[PDB]
Design an enzyme around this catalytic site. Sequence first.
Site, PDB file in Angstrom:
ATOM      1  N   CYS B 105       0.819  -1.210   0.000  1.00 23.79           N
ATOM      2  CA  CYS B 105       0.000   0.000   0.000  1.00 23.79           C
ATOM      3  C   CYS B 105       0.859   1.270   0.000  1.00 23.79           C
ATOM      4  CB  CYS B 105      -0.947  -0.032   1.206  1.00 23.79           C
ATOM      5  SG  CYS B 105      -2.377   1.089   1.020  1.00 23.79           S
ATOM      6  N   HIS B 125      -0.520   1.717  -3.409  1.00 26.14           N
ATOM      7  CA  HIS B 125      -1.920   2.063  -3.378  1.00 26.14           C
ATOM      8  C   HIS B 125      -2.036   3.168  -4.425  1.00 26.14           C
ATOM      9  CE1 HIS B 125      -5.912   2.626  -1.623  1.00 26.14           C
ATOM     10  NE2 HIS B 125      -5.761   3.858  -2.076  1.00 26.14           N
TER      11      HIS B 125
END
Lengths: 187, 187
Positions: B105, B125
Amino acid sequence: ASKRALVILAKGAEEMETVIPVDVMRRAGIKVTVAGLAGKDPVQCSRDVVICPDASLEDAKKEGPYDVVVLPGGNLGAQNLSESAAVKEILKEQENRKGLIAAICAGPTALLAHEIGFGSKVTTHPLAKDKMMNGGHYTYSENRVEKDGLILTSRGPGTSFEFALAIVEALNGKEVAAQVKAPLVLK
Amino acid sequence: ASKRALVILAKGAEEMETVIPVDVMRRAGIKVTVAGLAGKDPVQCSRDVVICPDASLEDAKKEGPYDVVVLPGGNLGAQNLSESAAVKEILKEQENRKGLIAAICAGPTALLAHEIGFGSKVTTHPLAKDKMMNGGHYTYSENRVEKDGLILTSRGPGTSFEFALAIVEALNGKEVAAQVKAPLVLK
């Protein structure tokens, strides 16, 4: 309005099934209380992850009622929940006030132990099916997430996001659930 | 043989991205050490879940080397990892010894901060892409899990299981990863 969720954390609980719902519900603006069954001390989960509850179940139950009571899985954790008189009381009161009760993986077996939601269609982890179905008090489902009225169940760590998003949809609606889902990168 | 994993936990870390990999790796028989960046005290994660590390990063680094160093996401957590001189040293040594480095992420931005794995194809992300790509030191991917040699990255909470299973496959093989995956009920 701000919904409230009670997550009961016991020794042996599946940490993923505890953290995913707590995290997702908080992303949904739900006020979540991680309550330690044994007290306010750190809880050693199934895969040794240690989580410090927000409060003891004893104190948390005094701050009710909650829009949803969540029961994580993990065989040993579920067993501890099933043996707790305090848990029995909380679930019976939640059921009586027509409040949502959500349990995942091995967690649903605690509903059986406390005679909660008999007659409902439910699902559990495949390995917990026989235990859950002892006596035929529920109708079994293979769906990843099963919701029959106020009894919401799911199958395992891998269904935790769907389980959590189902709780969010039940409490805050489909729009909120969709908004919370997008940033999670769930395919 | 028993592989070893170092998971660096900092304040603001995404709890799901911390617990899912720790849990899954332990299910794979990997010896995991949850190391607290700031010390041995409980760590308050991004959505307020509090996790108690197994040890401080200082002590954990003395028990190396590790077969994989894992960097969870969470913007504030990733920022803390990016600002740590201790983290910089650990990652540089891991890279130098050709050891696996995994980040998810927002976690990959810490690789950028410490100039780790430049030239690798990576993913993050969507909201962390611009930060990660500052300077064009990496080639961006939209794959849920991206592995370019010893640099393994993933996109978000929702890709945590795939991310963890990729780490397991890299360390213990495809067979073990498949065996660990089945009971998780991932579809």
